[PDB]
Amino acid sequence: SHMCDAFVGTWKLVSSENFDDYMKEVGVGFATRKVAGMAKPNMIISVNGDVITIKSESTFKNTEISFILGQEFDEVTADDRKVKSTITLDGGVLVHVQKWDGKSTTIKRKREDDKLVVECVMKGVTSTRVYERA
């Protein structure tokens, strides 16, 4: 057993708050915000050795990242930003930092009760998204 066991599996979005405002703060344009805000993604997390894979599947986009904790990678986000990302585990929370154009956003994923809670922060704006097991 290991590092991310309680994250592994298939998760479905059940609530969102403040996500349009988070996307505005990131710089996402109107049409992408509307369609992405409507999305109801499933998040699929798996681990093979030291490699963690996180997929987000929705009617808007299907994305996939694979990474090693603490080891930076280049990522194309669903809104087509080219970012440099690093994901670490900090006290049981997966912390995903994206850097681009002198900007930074952090996405935190944690287990709370039977939920996987996702907190997205861009300057002073936070969005909270809650997932349950599918």
Ligand X SMILES: CC1(C)COC2(CC[C@@H](CC(=O)O)[C@H](Cc3ccccc3)C2)OC1
130 is in an annotated binding site: yes
Q: Give me the residues paired with residue 109 across strands.
A: 94, 118
Residue 109 Cα distances to 30, 35, 55, 89, angstroms: 26, 23, 14, 10
The 11-50 contact track toward ligand X, x by CB under 6 A, reads ------------x--x-x-------x--x-x-x-------
d(CA 8, CA 83): 25
**Residue from 55, 61, 111, 115 that binds ligand X (CB under 6 A)?**
61
* Shorter beta-carbon distance to ligand X: residue 1 or 32: 32
**Residue from 47, 78, 117, 121 that binds ligand X (CB under 6 A)?**
78
d(CA 98, CA 47): 21
- Give binding residues for a fatty acid as ranges: 129-131
